[PDB]
Design a binder for these strands. Structure first.
Ligand SMILES: [Mg+2]
Ligand SMILES: [Zn+2]
Ligand SMILES: [Zn+2]
Ligand SMILES: [Zn+2]
Lengths: 49, 46, 49, 115, 476, 404, 82, 263, 67, 51
RNA sequence: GUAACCGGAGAGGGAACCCACU
């Protein structure tokens, strides 16, 4: 945190439909703490064999 | 002196003295709620 | 015996797994509670992704 | 915990005066009437009844602060006519208006009930 | 893709990605890949059909669930890697039709664009009619709006628990709230707001409240705080719950200990205040010294319930929860669903409050100077649709990208109920009775009460306690 | 007491005050004093220090009292100004067509602390006595102040042409011998600008007199606002539906121009601007076309704007909002920018998976042809969220450098 | 320095005005004899203000020059700003 | 320099509301009548709640608030009672208060609705508004009880007016309207054609608002006083008029005393 | 939790209208017909029942503290 | 350079147009906790005795 | 008009991390 590199904090184009664009804390964690979209699902992993 | 308590599970008023393990004489349940007090409560309707 | 692993609520080995709303109310649990958190020292803990 | 009691809006303390009269030194035949534990409900009608008197040169009210419970009525009248007597004539005319209104309203109710 | 769409060997979460200009073709199976479901589009037609919709509409009897829909090969889970190499359409009707051709080679379609929002941002009505920092602020303040946070809040002995007396589901809502269960555990009341400059007590982003409504229970809530304590720790320094007696125990506050029962606790239902003993605990002095827990200064609540039990060490353990209702006063922080926060500036009674041709006096008056720079046009549209809904009998629909409802349609619907089509009304001054020269914009809007009360922030000091290392005043 | 808002940036952040005891549990400070403190009353907390020794109490009284701190040494301007309802209501009150009844004039004059109890002769004696808003603001203005200001909507050609000293639009505020003769008072007259009416008042009369001037302005104007009224509504944001057609036509020709510029760039028919490469000159052409379109739609919006509009009633007074806020509300939100450029290609040579590859069109790179009334299509909503995220990040990041 | 060589301003600056008023009203608060006949006002700060306006404060100001020297300016002898 | 002569005619009389018109009076007088309607009409509502038992899921102060918002039928007793702050007695007597009792216990498996019918007054004429609704409608719900739950309380009803608390507000909706057609133009319509006609307006569909008259003064004040159920709508107006008249008389007495003490 | 006794804006009694409102909705009546069958002409009173969520039923599903 | 201080209060600010710019409204709870030390003198001795 | 019967005792660790407010 408290870093002057705003590039990680910015909303990336690949956040469409997987991370809420609006929802983020306004403090020193802008863009670093981001919630999850509604239908966004995180894969759980399986064997590739 | 009596300090009647309430079992969380079977809701049984059971006598407990000071410095005893928190135990219900039936059902062995270990969480107790105290009672409602006897002193007067006065509430304005505001 | 190796130890006791903290277990997440509403998980597949949690004691509230698959219980109906009437049973959850009988257990003084909220049927609307999504779960997904740990109870440790009687305090809800949520693993942030 | 700083909330004032609900009865503070209309109840006088011990030693308080319901009405206070202060002469206005800026202009002649002018007076400031400070009313405690009253509000627009009384101030507006008092001002309106005062404005009907042709011998009243100035009439208005204000509440200095809505959290406080006071209202200030400044009355300036023509010489040979006093602001105090102007205020009391306005009050005694408004009371007559209200009494006549009561009589007419109850008459209207009586004739509305099966009439 | 054929195997993944039938779940023969490749599971749905696995993503296959073909880079074309550069010859790599990558398959990912590891955990942590974030993905979302998308519809499958052939030549120019969806695989979702009237038969799918029908057999899934009659669910709970045909049990044709989302898993069966996935197995039908109708939807896929697409992560970012596979989202790079795919072509989506926002709406099948508007983006799959014969026209001046844009793509004509779609591969997937979105179920509904409103699903790009989160949880706190899915409760915003008309979020595409607001400036984005307003939406961010509303997503932040939705976590602070007080309401019934859980159904079993009375069995839940919890510190800092806030519940509202009369929560209401919003008159105007998104179709995404029924999935957040916001209409079952709402946080806020559908207030009738009048966006006007009445007296000046709302000038800088503040708000006037109706004192009579607050008396009637408007935004009234109760604050639950829980206190825990456990007895024990040494060879002879045994902790014990009891009433500390002055001749026996050495150290005591001026606080009155008669409120305690002889076991050392208060019975639930006893009025309590700051610097009042709640748990009488004493340690043996090698006569005795107390470690009694005092109620937090300036709390002034009432004990709700007292529980005694044993912790995992087998020692007596007590938790006590204290009720304290918080009547909305001036300075309490209120906010809408559009990032329009504000503290109450003054509370006028119903007589002092402006009113319509009827006796409708706004529960809330906010400064109109909060709209033009914030540009919360969603707030105005919510205030309009709320009146339309409360007059029609329907619950308003504020899906972000609905495109089936707009300001003109809402205005035409409102004009049928005897109101000005743009929501304005002719209010009368509450003090003088003269009708306000300008016409007031008024209507039901879903306001929220935030946890930031003023009684939890106000404090002073005059030579109080002092730190130990450097003799400066304490902090907190 | 001395009273500050904790992020103290200048000596107009710690200012003296006289304590008045009020019932409820909140600090209450006058609305002109909001500007120096940078307060917002949106949950702000301010902490109050009481000087204990009588020497330091007198020192605060003689140095840091707010009436003494009106004019900054930072930019030789007044810091407190009429703000946020009182400014708009003054603009509406000092208009030419503002007339007050006998009872209304008495009610307003009752809120003047610096009033001699002498009712001025009304601007109209027959058929029936009516006063004017300027006639009451002249009593509000203290002493004998002489200043000349210009209203926000003052036309440029008015000074050159005739009617120079008799303004058709009632602009060119002229205060003479402590009396408002003509002109509509706006931000540029009663605000924090240099040479404003309040600045002249502070420089001529005492700081206490200028304090009384704030108090009288705010009280009497807020009490006239009880009669006048000021709102904002969804009807204030609608157009004539001929302005909607004009805006749609402007957007459509702008889109056609962008498309044909893209065609010229693709057919290698576009010559790079000297001092720039092909990519940046194409970017410059696209930005010029989009900005011209946005400006034209905004100007059409203000032209369509009515006299009774509350958005205009706010922006002209300067209390809140700007002339581009109305354009973004009614006509066109605009083109979203991240780091000055259009929305970058986050995906493989495209912005979102809804756009075809290598799509440089206005809709594909952040331009929002919809306003805040018609709503934003989901692509435009995401682009606007991403654009506002940049400003939100900058707001947080800038503090740790500026305070240091 | 001697009375002939006084190079500082003859105007009583705002800091001198604040500190003289504070330190004189403090003396009035400690029951120092007032230099001006009062009309029943009880606040020592207003008493000190009245004394300053009447030019009767029994205090002189030592203005230290940067080189190390100083000048003794009597409150009655230099011009009050307000 | 004297009072004007107002006239009143009733346009609708009902147990729920009274709608009428007042002529030849001032805007300030009409507003003060409308204002006393809400603020200064004394009624009987319960202000002292003592809960002996509460096993419900709504807490004690919630129950007390919902109880206090319950209106009580006080048509003539409110005139003959006294404010508890003015009565010479101790805590409570029948001369300044009315005792209420509520003892409900749920024993069957069916959910028990605790309503205002379960409140037992000591005075038979001061009761909730479940008195008469024949010429089916429900009663005010207080709380719902599960099997085994109960609550026992004793309450007192004081005399108060709406300036203290909204529970002493005898009226629900006080419609106030003067000059329905904008003849005085106290309000200014940017587009008068878009505004719906008032109920009391007398204009054809062609005309949007009345022509302006500079000589006009506000008269013909239209009221629609809707009672909550405690007082009759017809007696709310009479009580408000009496209260305003006695308030003015008290102010006049204080002014006369002050003047005669100053002279 | 439970239906308020009075409308916050108007003050008209709404506490007795909830059960009748639910009964009317347990019929062909729509919300717009049930509200004015109960006599709610103002939208201030209409929203009181239209937007009310009745959480007391979910609260009663839990066993009480006593017996 | 900076440190905690006595005789200081903090709460939420709210607008109020009915008091001058030099006035600030403080609650009775804050005013009844923070104190100012007045030196007794024969002028204010009776007032301070009553206080 | 007694050996004041206790003398009003309040100072109440700290570090770490997290969330949040302006
Ligand atoms: Mg702020
Ligand atoms: Zn048991
Ligand atoms: Zn009695
Ligand atoms: Zn209502």
């Amino acid at each position: 945190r408290d870093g002057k590199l705003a590039k990680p904090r910015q909303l990336h184009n690949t956040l469409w439909g997987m991370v809420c664009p609006a929802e983020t804390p306004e403090g020193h964690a802008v863009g670093l703490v981001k919630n999850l979209a509604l239908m966004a699902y995180i894969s759980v992993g399986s064997q590739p064999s | 002196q009596p300090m009647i308590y309430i079992c969380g599970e079977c809701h049984t008023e059971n006598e407990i003295k000071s410095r005893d393990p928190i135990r219900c004489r039936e059902c062995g349940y270990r969480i107790m709620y105290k009672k409602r007090t006897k002193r007067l409560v006065v509430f304005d309707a505001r | 015996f190796i130890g006791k692993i903290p277990i997440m609520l509403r998980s597949t080995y949690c004691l509230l797994n698959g219980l109906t709303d009437r049973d959850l109310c009988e257990l003084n649990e909220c049927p609307l509670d999504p779960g997904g958190y740990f109870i440790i020292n009687g305090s809800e803990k949520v693993l942030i992704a | 915990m700083n909330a004032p009691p609900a009865f503070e809006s209309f109840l006088l303390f011990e030693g308080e005066k319901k009405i206070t009269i202060n002469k206005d030194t800026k202009v002649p035949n002018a007076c400031l009437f400070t009313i405690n534990k009253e509000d627009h409900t009384l101030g507006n009608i008092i001002k309106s009844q005062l404005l009907k008197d042709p011998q009243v040169l100035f009439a208005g009210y204000k509440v200095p602060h809505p959290l406080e419970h006071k209202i200030i009525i400044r009355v300036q009248t023509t010489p040979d006519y006093s602001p105090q007597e102007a205020f009391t004539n306005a009050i005694t005319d408004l009371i007559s208006e209200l009494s006549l209104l009561e009589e007419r309203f109850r008459v209207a109710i009586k004739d509305k009930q099966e009439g | 893709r054929k195997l993944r769409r039938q779940m023969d060997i490749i599971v749905s979460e696995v993503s296959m990605i073909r880079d074309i200009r550069e010859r790599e073709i990558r398959i990912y199976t590891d955990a942590g890949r974030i993905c979302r479901p998308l519809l499958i589009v052939e030549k120019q037609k969806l695989l979702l059909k009237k038969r799918h919709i029908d057999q899934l509409k009659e669910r709970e009897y045909n049990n044709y669930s989302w898993q069966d829909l996935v197995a039908s090969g109708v939807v896929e889970y697409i992560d970012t890697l596979e989202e790079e190499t795919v072509m989506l359409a926002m709406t099948p009707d508007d983006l799959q039709e014969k026209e001046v051709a844009y793509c004509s080679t779609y591969t997937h379609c979105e179920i509904h664009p409103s699903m790009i929002l989160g949880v706190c941002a899915s409760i915003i009505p008309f979020p595409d009619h607001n400036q984005s920092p307003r939406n961010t602020y509303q997503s932040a303040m939705g976590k602070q709006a007080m309401g019934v946070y859980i159904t079993n809040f009375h069995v839940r002995m919890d510190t800092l628990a806030h519940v509202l007396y009369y929560p209401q589901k919003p008159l105007v809502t998104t179709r995404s709230m029924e999935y957040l269960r916001f209409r079952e555990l709402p946080a806020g009341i559908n207030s009738i707001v009048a966006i006007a400059s009445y007296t000046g007590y709302n000038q800088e982003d503040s708000v006037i409240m109706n004192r009579s409504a607050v008396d009637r229970g408007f935004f009234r809530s109760v604050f639950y705080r829980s206190y825990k304590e456990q007895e024990s720790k040494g060879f002879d320094q045994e902790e014990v719950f009891e009433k500390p007696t002055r001749e026996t125990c050495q150290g005591m506050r001026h606080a009155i200990y008669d409120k305690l029962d002889d076991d050392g606790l208060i019975a639930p239902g006893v009025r309590v205040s700051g610097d009042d003993v709640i748990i009488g605990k004493t340690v043996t002095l090698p006569t005795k010294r107390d470690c009694s827990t005092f109620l937090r200064t300036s709390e002034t609540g009432i004990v709700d319930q007292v529980m005694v039990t044993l912790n995992q060490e087998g020692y007596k353990f007590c938790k006590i929860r204290v009720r304290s209702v918080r009547i909305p006063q001036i300075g309490d922080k209120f906010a809408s669903r559009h990032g329009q926060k504000g503290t109450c500036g003054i509370q006028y009674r119903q007589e002092d409050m402006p009113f319509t041709c009827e006796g409708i006096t706004p529960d809330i008056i906010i400064n109109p100077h909060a709209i033009p720079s914030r540009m919360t046009i969603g707030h105005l549209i919510e205030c309009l649709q709320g009146k339309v809904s409360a007059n029609k009998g329907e619950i308003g629909d504020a899906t972000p990208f609905n495109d089936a409802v707009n300001v003109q349609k809402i205005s035409n619907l409102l004009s049928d109920y005897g109101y000005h089509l743009r929501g304005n009304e002719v209010l009368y001054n509450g003090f003088t009775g003269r009708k306000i020269t300008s016409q007031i914009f008024i209507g039901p809007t879903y306001y929220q009460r935030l946890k930031h009360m003023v009684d939890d922030k106000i404090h002073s000091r005059a030579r109080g306690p002092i730190q130990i290392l450097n003799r400066q005043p304490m902090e907190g | 007491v001395i009273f500050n808002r904790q992020p103290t940036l200048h000596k107009m952040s710690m200012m003296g005050h006289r304590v008045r005891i009020l019932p409820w549990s909140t600090f209450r400070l006058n609305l002109s004093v909001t500007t120096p403190y940078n307060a917002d009353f949106d949950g702000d907390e301010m902490n109050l220090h009481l000087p204990q020794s009588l020497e330091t109490r007198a020192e605060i009284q003689e140095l840091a009292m707010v009436p003494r701190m009106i004019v900054t040494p930072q930019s030789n301007r007044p810091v407190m100004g009429i703000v946020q309802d009182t400014l708009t209501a003054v603009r509406k009150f000092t208009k030419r067509d503002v007339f007050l009844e006998r009872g209304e004039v008495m009610n307003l004059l009752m809120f003047l602390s610096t009033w001699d109890g002498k009712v001025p002769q009304p601007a109209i004696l027959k058929p029936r006595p009516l006063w004017t808003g300027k006639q009451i603001f002249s009593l509000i203005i203290p002493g004998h102040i002489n200043c000349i200001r210009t209203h926000s909507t003052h036309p440029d050609d008015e000074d050159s042409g005739p009617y120079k000293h008799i303004s058709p639009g009632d602009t060119k505020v002229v205060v003479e011998n402590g009396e408002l003769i003509m002109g509509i008072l706006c931000k540029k007259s009663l605000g924090t600008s240099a040479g404003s009416l309040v600045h002249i008042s502070y420089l001529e009369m005492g700081h206490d007199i200028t304090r009384l001037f704030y108090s009288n302005i705010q009280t009497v104007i807020n009490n006239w606002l009880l009669i006048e009224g000021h709102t904002i509504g969804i009807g204030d944001s609608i157009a004539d539906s001929k302005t909607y057609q004009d805006i749609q036509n402007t957007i459509k020709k702008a889109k056609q121009d962008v498309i044909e510029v893209i065609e010229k760039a693709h057919n290698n028919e576009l010559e790079p601007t000297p001092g720039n490469t092909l990519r940046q000159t194409f970017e410059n052409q696209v930005n010029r076309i989009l900005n011209d379109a946005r400006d034209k739609t905004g100007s059409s919006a203000q032209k369509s704007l009515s006299e009774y509009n509350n958005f205009k009633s706010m922006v002209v007074s300067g209390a809140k909002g700007s002339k581009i806020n109305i354009s973004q509300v009614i006509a066109v939100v605009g083109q979203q920018n991240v780091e000055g450029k259009r929305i970058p290609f986050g995906f493989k040579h495209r912005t979102l998976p809804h756009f075809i590859k290598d799509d440089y069109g206005p809709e594909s790179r952040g331009f929002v042809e919809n306003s805040y009334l018609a709503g934003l299509t989901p692509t435009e909503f995401f682009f606007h969220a991403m654009g506002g995220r940049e400003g939100l990040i900058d707001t947080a990041v800038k503090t740790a450098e500026t305070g240091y | 320095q001697a009375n002939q060589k006084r190079i500082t301003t003859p105007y009583m600056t705002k800091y001198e005005r604040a500190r003289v008023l504070g330190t004189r009203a403090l003396q009035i608060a400690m029951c120092a004899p007032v230099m001006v006949e009062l009309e029943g006002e009880t606040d020592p700060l207003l008493i000190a203000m009245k004394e300053l306006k009447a030019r009767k404060i029994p205090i002189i100001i030592r203005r230290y020059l940067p080189d190390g020297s100083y000048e003794d300016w009597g409150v009655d002898e230099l011009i009050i700003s307000d | 320099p004297y009072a004007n002569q107002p006239t009143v005619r009733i346009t609708e009389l009902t147990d729920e509301n009274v709608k009428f018109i007042i002529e030849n009076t001032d805007l300030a007088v009409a507003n003060s009548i409308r204002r006393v309607f809400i603020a200064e009409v004394p009624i009987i509502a319960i202000d002292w709640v003592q809960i002996d038992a509460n096993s419900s899921v709504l807490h004690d102060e919630f129950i007390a608030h919902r109880l206090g918002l319950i209106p009580l039928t006080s048509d003539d007793i409110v005139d003959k009672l006294q404010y508890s702050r003015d009565c010479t007695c101790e805590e409570f007597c029948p001369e300044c208060s009315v005792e209420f009792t509520l003892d409900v216990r749920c024993n069957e498996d069916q959910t028990r609705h605790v309503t205002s019918r379960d409140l037992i007054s000591n005075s038979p004429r001061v009761i909730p508004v479940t008195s008469r609704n024949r010429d089916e409608q429900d009663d005010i719900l207080i709380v719902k009880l599960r099997k085994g739950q109960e609550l026992r309380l004793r309450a007192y009803a004081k005399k108060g007016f709406g300036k203290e608390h909204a529970k002493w507000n005898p009226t629900a909706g006080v419609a106030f309207e003067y000059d329905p057609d904008n003849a005085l133009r106290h309000t200014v319509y940017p587009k008068p054609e878009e505004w719906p006609k008032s109920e009391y307006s007398e204009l054809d569909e062609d005309e949007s608002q009345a022509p302006y008259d500079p000589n006009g003064k506000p008269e013909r004040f239209y009221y629609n006083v809707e009672s909550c159920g405690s007082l009759r709508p017809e007696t709310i107006v009479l009580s408000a008029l009496s209260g305003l008249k006695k308030k003015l008389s008290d102010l006049q007495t204080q002014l006369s005393h002050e003047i005669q003490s100053d002279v | 939790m439970i239906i308020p006794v009075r409308c916050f804006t108007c003050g008209k009694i709404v506490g007795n209208k909830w059960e009748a409102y639910l009964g009317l909705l347990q019929a062909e009546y729509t919300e717009g017909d049930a509200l004015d069958a109960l006599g709610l002409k103002r939208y201030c009173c209409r929203r009181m029942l239209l937007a009310h969520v009745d959480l007391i039923e979910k609260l009663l599903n839990y066993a009480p503290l006593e017996k | 350079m900076g440190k905690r201080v006595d005789f200081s209060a903090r709460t939420v600010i709210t607008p109020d147009p009915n008091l001058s710019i030099d006035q600030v409204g403080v609650p009775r709870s804050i005013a009844a906790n923070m104190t100012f030390a007045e030196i007794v003198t024969p002028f204010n001795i009776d007032r301070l005795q009553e206080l």
